[PDB]
Design a protein around this ligand. Structure first.
Ligand code: NA
Ligand code: NA
Length: 266
């Protein structure tokens, strides 16, 4: 492209966040193609860890196709893409996940030879109706050659997605990643669109390039609207919980508001 400057190129590209039954797909605006992105399959009700998956969105396509199958209503897809006129060929994406029953160890992923981290995030999870009690998110760190995610809070699976770039790419040093876990625990269906919040903040003197916020929920099929891109050049990205709870009798659905951004120096 005419601009060789990673903060500017990433800010000017269009973000798209899509929710629906998996695998699904998210489409770039007409005339644009994928630069980077991810597709998730998530299910925070059914047992086990097979229903958690992240894959990268390959560049240069008009859409990003998702992953996983719609076996129950509680299976959901969440797809995030950044679209522009052409790919940034210096970017390479990496995903990793732990095997079933190998979640007690630290997950590690490395950038391809001679590249370094632009950004990304890792998540740890557990299945079952209470499994969001073990949810965590950690950002990857710009300028490293690796990203890792460690188990915590009783989690049984780790997964991560990151973007890497040639080490000399202009402007890389101006970028910083932030991930946040906000309100989490039992959901409250009487807090009208006000069931806790997440507030992902840039460090002082930086503003948002891209990112997203999401409500994770036992019943993901009822919080599809709670998945949104983060606003360019804002100081923070915020979202409230919807206030949804399909638990029977005395049982509460669980939720977790979380997000991830890349910020750039102002
Ligand atoms: Na943008
Ligand atoms: Na579904």
């Amino acid at each position: 492209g005419v601009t060789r400057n990673l903060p500017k190129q990433l800010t000017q590209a269009t973000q798209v966040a899509w929710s629906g039954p998996p695998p699904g797909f998210a489409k770039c605006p007409g005339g644009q193609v994928v630069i980077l992105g991810f597709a998730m399959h998530l299910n925070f009700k059914e047992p086990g860890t097979d229903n958690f998956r992240i894959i990268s969105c390959p560049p240069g396509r008009e859409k990003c196709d998702g992953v996983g199958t719609a076996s129950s209503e509680t299976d959901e897809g969440r797809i995030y893409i950044l679209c522009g006129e052409e790919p940034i060929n210096e970017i390479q994406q990496v995903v990793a996940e732990s095997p079933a029953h190998a979640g007690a160890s630290v997950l590690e992923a490395s950038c391809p030879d001679e590249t370094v981290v632009v950004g990304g995030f890792g998540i740890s999870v557990r299945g079952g109706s209470d499994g969001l009690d073990s949810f965590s998110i950690e950002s990857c760190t710009t300028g490293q050659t690796i990203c890792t995610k460690a188990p915590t809070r009783g989690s049984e699976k780790n997964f991560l997605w990151m973007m890497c770039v040639d080490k000399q790419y202009p402007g890389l040093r101006e970028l910083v990643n932030v991930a946040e876990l906000g309100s989490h625990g039992n959901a409250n269906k009487r807090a009208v669109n006000s069931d806790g919040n997440v507030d992902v903040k840039c460090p002082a003197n930086s503003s948002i390039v891209l990112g997203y916020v999401m409500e994770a929920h036992t019943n993901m099929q009822f919080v599809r609207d709670k998945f949104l891109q983060c606003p360019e050049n804002a100081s923070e990205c915020k979202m409230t919980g919807k206030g949804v709870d399909h638990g029977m009798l005395w049982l509460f659905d669980r939720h977790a508001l979380f997000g991830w951004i890349i910020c750039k120096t102002v």
